[PDB]
Amino acid sequence: DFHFSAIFQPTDPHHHQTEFAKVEGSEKYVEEVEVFGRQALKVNPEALTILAHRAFSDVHHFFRKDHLEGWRRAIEDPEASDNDRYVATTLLKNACIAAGRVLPSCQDTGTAIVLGKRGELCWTGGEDEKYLSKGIWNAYRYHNLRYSQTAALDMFKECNTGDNLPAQLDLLAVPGSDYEFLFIAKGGGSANKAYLYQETKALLNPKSLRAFIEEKLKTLGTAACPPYHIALVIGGTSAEMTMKTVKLASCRYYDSLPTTGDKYGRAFRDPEWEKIVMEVAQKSGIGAQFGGKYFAHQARVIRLPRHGASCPVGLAVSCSADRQILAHINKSGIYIEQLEQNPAQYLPDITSVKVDLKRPIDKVRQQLSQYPVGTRVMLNGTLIVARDIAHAKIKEMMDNGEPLPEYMKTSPIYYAGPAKTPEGYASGSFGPTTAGAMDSYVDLFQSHGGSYITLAKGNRSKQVTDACKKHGGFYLGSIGGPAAILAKDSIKQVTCLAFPELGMEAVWKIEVEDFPAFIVVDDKGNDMYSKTLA
Amino acid sequence: DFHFSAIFQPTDPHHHQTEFAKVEGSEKYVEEVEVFGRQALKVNPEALTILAHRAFSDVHHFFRKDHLEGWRRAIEDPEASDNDRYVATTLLKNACIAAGRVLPSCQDTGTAIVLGKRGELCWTGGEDEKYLSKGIWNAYRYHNLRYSQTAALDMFKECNTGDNLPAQLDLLAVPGSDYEFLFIAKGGGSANKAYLYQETKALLNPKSLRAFIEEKLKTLGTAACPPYHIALVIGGTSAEMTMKTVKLASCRYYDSLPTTGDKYGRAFRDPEWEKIVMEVAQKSGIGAQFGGKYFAHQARVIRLPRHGASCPVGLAVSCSADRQILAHINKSGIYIEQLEQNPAQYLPTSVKVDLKRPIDKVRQQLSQYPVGTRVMLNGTLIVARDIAHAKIKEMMDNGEPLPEYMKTSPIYYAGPAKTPEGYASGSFGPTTAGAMDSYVDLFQSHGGSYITLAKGNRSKQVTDACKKHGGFYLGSIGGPAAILAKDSIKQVTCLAFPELGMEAVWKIEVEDFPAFIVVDDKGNDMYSKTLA
Ligand code: SF4
Numbered sequence A: 001d002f003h004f005s006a007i008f009q010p011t012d013p014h015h016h017q018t019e020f021a022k023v024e025g026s027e028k029y030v031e032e033v034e035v036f037g038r039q040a041l042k043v044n045p046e047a048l049t050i051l052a053h054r055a056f057s058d059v060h061h062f063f064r065k066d067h068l069e070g071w072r073r074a075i076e077d078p079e080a081s082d083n084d085r086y087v088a089t090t091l092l093k094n095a096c097i098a099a100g101r102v103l104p105s106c107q108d109t110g111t112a113i114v115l116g117k118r119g120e121l122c123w124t125g126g127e128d129e130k131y132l133s134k135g136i137w138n139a140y141r142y143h144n145l146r147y148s149q150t151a152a153l154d155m156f157k158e159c160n161t162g163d164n165l166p167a168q169l170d171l172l173a174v175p176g177s178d179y180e181f182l183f184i185a186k187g188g189g190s191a192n193k194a195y196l197y198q199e200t201k202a203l204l205n206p207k208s209l210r211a212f213i214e215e216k217l218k219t220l221g222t223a224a225c226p227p228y229h230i231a232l233v234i235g236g237t238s239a240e241m242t243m244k245t246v247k248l249a250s251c252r253y254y255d256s257l258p259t260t261g262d263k264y265g266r267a268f269r270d271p272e273w274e275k276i277v278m279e280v281a282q283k284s285g286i287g288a289q290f291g292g293k294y295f296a297h298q299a300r301v302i303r304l305p306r307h308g309a310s311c312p313v314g315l316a317v318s319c320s321a322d323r324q325i326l327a328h329i330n331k332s333g334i335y336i337e338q339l340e341q342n343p344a345q346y347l348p349d350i351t352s353v354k355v356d357l358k359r360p361i362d363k364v365r366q367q368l369s370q371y372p373v374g375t376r377v378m379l380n381g382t383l384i385v386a387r388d389i390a391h392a393k394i395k396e397m398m399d400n401g402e403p404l405p406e407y408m409k410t411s412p413i414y415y416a417g418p419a420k421t422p423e424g425y426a427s428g429s430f431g432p433t434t435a436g437a438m439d440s441y442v443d444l445f446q447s448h449g450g451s452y453i454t455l456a457k458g459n460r461s462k463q464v465t466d467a468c469k470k471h472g473g474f475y476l477g478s479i480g481g482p483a484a485i486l487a488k489d490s491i492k493q494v495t496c497l498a499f500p501e502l503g504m505e506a507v508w509k510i511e512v513e514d515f516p517a518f519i520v521v522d523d524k525g526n527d528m529y530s531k532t533l534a
Numbered sequence B: 001d002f003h004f005s006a007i008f009q010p011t012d013p014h015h016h017q018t019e020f021a022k023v024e025g026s027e028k029y030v031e032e033v034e035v036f037g038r039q040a041l042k043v044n045p046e047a048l049t050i051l052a053h054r055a056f057s058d059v060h061h062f063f064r065k066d067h068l069e070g071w072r073r074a075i076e077d078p079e080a081s082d083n084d085r086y087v088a089t090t091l092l093k094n095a096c097i098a099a100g101r102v103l104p105s106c107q108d109t110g111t112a113i114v115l116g117k118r119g120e121l122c123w124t125g126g127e128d129e130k131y132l133s134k135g136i137w138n139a140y141r142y143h144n145l146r147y148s149q150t151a152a153l154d155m156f157k158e159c160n161t162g163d164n165l166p167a168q169l170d171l172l173a174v175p176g177s178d179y180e181f182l183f184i185a186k187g188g189g190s191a192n193k194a195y196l197y198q199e200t201k202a203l204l205n206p207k208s209l210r211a212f213i214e215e216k217l218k219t220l221g222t223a224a225c226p227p228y229h230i231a232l233v234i235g236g237t238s239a240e241m242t243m244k245t246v247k248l249a250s251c252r253y254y255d256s257l258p259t260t261g262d263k264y265g266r267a268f269r270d271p272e273w274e275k276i277v278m279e280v281a282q283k284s285g286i287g288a289q290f291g292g293k294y295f296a297h298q299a300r301v302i303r304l305p306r307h308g309a310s311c312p313v314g315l316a317v318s319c320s321a322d323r324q325i326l327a328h329i330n331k332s333g334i335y336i337e338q339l340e341q342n343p344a345q346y347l348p349t350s351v352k353v354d355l356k357r358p359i360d361k362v363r364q365q366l367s368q369y370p371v372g373t374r375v376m377l378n379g380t381l382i383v384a385r386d387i388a389h390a391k392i393k394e395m396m397d398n399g400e401p402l403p404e405y406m407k408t409s410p411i412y413y414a415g416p417a418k419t420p421e422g423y424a425s426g427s428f429g430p431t432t433a434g435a436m437d438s439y440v441d442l443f444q445s446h447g448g449s450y451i452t453l454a455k456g457n458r459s460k461q462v463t464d465a466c467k468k469h470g471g472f473y474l475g476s477i478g479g480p481a482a483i484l485a486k487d488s489i490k491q492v493t494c495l496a497f498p499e500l501g502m503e504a505v506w507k508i509e510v511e512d513f514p515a516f517i518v519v520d521d522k523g524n525d526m527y528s529k530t531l532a
C-alpha cells in the first residue's frame, strides 16, 4: 500500500527547454570513473570557481527572452498606458547599455545565491562552498559590480564586507553523478517583497482567494521595480519550504511541473489562477511603476500539500533586474544557460518639465509646487545622495544634540548607492533604492529644514505625504531599474562628501543632466498612488 | 585578498553534546571502503528506512531534558502563577502517559520533516527520499499516530493522504563520508507560528528592537500551546534562509554557534538579547497558557548578515509537543539521539458542568461565572474543526439548515489520532481555536455553536459574537492529548463526513474534562489584558 511520491515532479528536471553553451575546453575538469560497478564523475573543484565566476558576470549584462518579451509587450500592447510604454522602453534601452558588458543592468548587483544539486557519485573533493565563493568573489571583485553585504559585528554595529560575500549556498544531495545549478543575483528590493502569510482552510475557496490576491498584490506596490514576475504559492510543508518554493517559482524554475494534483499531494502549477493573478494585476491600474496595465510580466501559481491545521502562503516577485542562470557539470564539461545578447531586437522600429536644480532649493520647491502629481520632470543639477545607513547615522547625531548637516539642506536627496565606476567612466550604475525605508526620517528632517525634496523609487507611507504637506515638500519618483543608462547618460560627476567608510552607502554629491522623474507626492496632500495603492 | 567564511560555524557541528544510542546490529548496514585514496562509506538504503521509522516512533513518546526541565521550573518557581503550575503539571503527567509508548504525546503527530546531510563519499544508492519516506510511512501506519497531510486535487478540492505523507525531505550535500540527520515531527499549531517580517535598518537599535520584540511576542498568543521555545532571527540572505534558520534555532540545532560577529558576516547567537526576549516573555503576563510567568521555556536569538537594502526577521516557536531527534549513520552503524525515558522524575477548585442537559441550561450555568473560572465538563461533545466548519457554512450558503449536531452540545475543535487496540480513544487534545473564528457569529446567529471548546486566544469577532448571542468559548489545556484520552474520553463515534479522516465530525462522551472560561456571554475575554 506504500507509494512514494516526490512533491516536485517536473517533466523537464534537467531543463532541456533551456539553451546552454559549453565553456570551451572545460572537459579537462572532469573524469569518468567506475567504482563498485557504478559510474562516477571526478570534478576538479576549480570548475566550480570558473562556473560561478562566469555566471555572476554574465547575468548582470543579459536577460532571458521571456523577460525581454514582457517589456516589448508593454510597448506594443494598445492597452498599455503611455507611462507603461515609457517605462518599458527605458528599461529596454537600459538593457542595451548593459549588454555592452561594462555597466551592470542595476546598481544593486544583488546577493549571490547558489542552488546546487550534487549527485551522489559526483566527487568534487568536498570544498564546494569555498570554490564557489571564490568564483563569486572573482565576479564582484574584478567587474564593475557592487559590494552589497552588511556584516553584523554585534547586534547593531555593522560594516560592509567589502566583497559581496557571504553568499547563500544551498547545496543539495541528489541521485546521479552530475552537478546542476541555479545561480541567482537577487536584488535587495525584490528580496524585500517576499512575503509569508499564515492562513487557514477558510481562505481556500474562489471568492476568498480572489479577494486575498487583490489585497496582497497592492502591498507589493511599485517598491520592487515592476513589471513583476509574480509568484504565488498556496500551501506547503513549512514556512521555509513555502518561501523557498515561491522564490524558485519566481525564477521560473518550476515551469514544467504538472498542472493537476493527486491523492499523494504532489505540487502542481495552476494556469487558471495564474490567469486570475494576471487579471488582478492588470485591472489594478498600478501599471509599470506609474499607472497602467503592466504591473506584471507573467504569473506563476503553485499549489502545495498542507498539514490540516495549516495553510502557509508565499508571495514574491522577480524585479526588473531579473537575474538567474541555469548551469550543469557533466562528463562533457561545464554548461551555462545562454542569455539574450542582442536585447535591441525587442525595441520597436517606431512632454516633461525642465527643473533646474542649480538654484536655491526654495526656488525649486516653488517651481515644483506649480504642477500636479504625475507630472514628468527632467532634473538638471546637484543631488545629495544618502540612503539607509547614512539616514540612521544622521538621526543618531541629531538625537545626540547635533544639527542636521548643512549638506542635507542645499539639494534634493537622492536615495541611492552606486556600483563601482568603470575606468574612464564618470559613474558606475547608479539607480535609485526603495524609498519606503527612509519614510521614518522625512518628517524629522523636514522639521529641521532639510530633505524637502527626495528622489527615489517606490510608493511611500502616509507619513511622507503628511510631512510634505506640512513642510512644503516633494517626493519625486525616479524610474526604478535603469541604472546603466542613468549612469551613461545622466550622471556627469560623482564625489564622496561624507561617511566614506560606508562604501556604496556613503553620502555622495553628484551632478546630473536630463534625469527623469515623476512628481509622486506634492506639497498639498496628493499622491499619485493614492487611487491604485489605496 | 579572498577569505572564505561560512555563515554558520558551530563549535559542535556534529552535535557531540548530544547522547546517542546505537541501533543493535546496525553495523551490518554499513561498510567502510577506500576509493581513489579516500575513505568512503557504503550504506544499505534500508538503514534510512530503519532510522526514520525508529525516529518518528520514539519522538512521540519522550522529550528532551531541556523541555522537561522547563516544565519542572514552572512548577517549582515561587513566582509562577497557580495556572502556570497547573498547566505544567498537566503536561508532565501527559508526558508520563506518552512514555508508555502506546499513546502519542499529542494528537497532532505532525508533519514529518527530515534535514539530512549526506557526505560526498557516503553512498546510499541515491534513493534516499523513497527509503526515508518508507520509514516514515511505517511509523505512522503501524503506530497509534495520525494522518495529518491534506492533498490538493485541484486548487480547492482536497483529500487526506491517509498516511501522513508527503514528508519534507531536505537532503544537503556536505563533506566527508557520514550521513547526519535532524528529524522533526512538527505540529501544525507551532508551524503556524512561524512569522516572517520585512524590516529595515531603522529597526536596528536597542529601543526599536525591544519594542518590536514586545509587539510580536503577543501575536504568538497562546495558540501554539506555550511554554514556548522562542526563536528569533535578525537578518538573513533571503526570506527562506531566515525562516529555515529560525526553525533550526527553535530546535536548538544552532546552540553551539559563536556569540560574536566578525567582518566576514558570520552568524552568531546573541545571549544578551536572548535574556531580553525571556524578560519580555516573563513580564508579558501571558504565562503558560492562562496567565503567569511561564510564557517561554527559553529563547534563541541568532544574528545574520544582510543585504544593505534588506532586513528579514524570523520569529518561530517550538510548542509543548517539542519533537526533534538527531541521528547519524557512520562506519559503526545507526545512532539515534537518546531522549528522556523517565519523565516522572521531573514531577515534584473547579466548577462541575453537566452537559447532559438542554444546551440552554448549560449556557445558563456558565453565565453565572466570570472568565478565568476552571470548569469540569461531563457529557457529550460534538467534535468539528476546519474542513467540517467550511462544509457546513457551504451547506447554509445553499439554503440548508445548520445541522442538528451543531446545536445540541459544545463544539470541541479537535481531530483524534488513531485508537490503540482495546482503548476507548487515541490521543485527542484540542486544535487551535482561531482557525474557526470566522464561523462563530454566523453559526450562532443560526442557533448553534453557542459553546465552543478548544485552545488558544481568539479574535475580537468571537468576543462580540458571544456577547451578541449569549455564547461562550472554553479553553482546554493545549497539548495534553494522551492524558485527556486516557482519563476523560469514554466513547468516540464518527458522526459525519467520514471521508475527512481525523477531520470528520465526531461525537464523544467525556468525564472530568478540564477547561477555563476564556470568553463569556458579556464581552469579557481572559486574554484581554495580556494579549491586548
Ligand atoms: S533597484 Fe529595482 S531592479 Fe534593481 S535590484 Fe532593486 S528592485 Fe531590482
Ligand code: SF4
Binding pocket: B106, B107, B108, B186, B187, B188, B189, B190, B223, B224, B225, B319, B320, B321, B429, B430, B431, B478, B479
Ligand atoms: S496541539 Fe499544541 S502541542 Fe500539539 S502540535 Fe499543536 S501546538 Fe503543538
